[PDB]
Amino acid sequence: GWIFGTTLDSKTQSLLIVNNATNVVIKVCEFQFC
Amino acid sequence: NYLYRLFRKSKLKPFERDISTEIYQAGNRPCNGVAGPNCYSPLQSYGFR
């Protein structure tokens, strides 16, 4: 998947897909990656 | 209880929301999270009477 956004403390999209139950979570919250 | 934004580095896209409250830098002096003479808080409250 891809984790589109900017200045990775605020906003940012997150496309985790292939859960093997076929789910396309495109949750858009505030995250902290790595 | 109602706020609005005054200072931002650029304009907005059509239908864009902004949540992050970072201290504005109006000059060459860095703010580093401290609202000094050239650093202002970006959210000012409405006054309703």
Q: Which of A18, B1, B36, B18 is nearest to A1 (CA)?
A: A18
- B20 at the A interface (CB within 8 A)? yes
Which residues in chain B have Cβ-Cβ distances shorter than 8 Å to A12? none
> Which approach determined this entry?
cryo-EM
> CA angle at residue A17 from A15 to A23, to 5 degrees?
115
Kindly provide the resolution of this structure in angstroms, with one decimal: 3.3
Q: Is A25 exposed, middle or buried (0-12, 13-18, 19+ CB in 10 A)?
A: exposed
Distance from CA of A18 to the nearest CA of B (A): 29
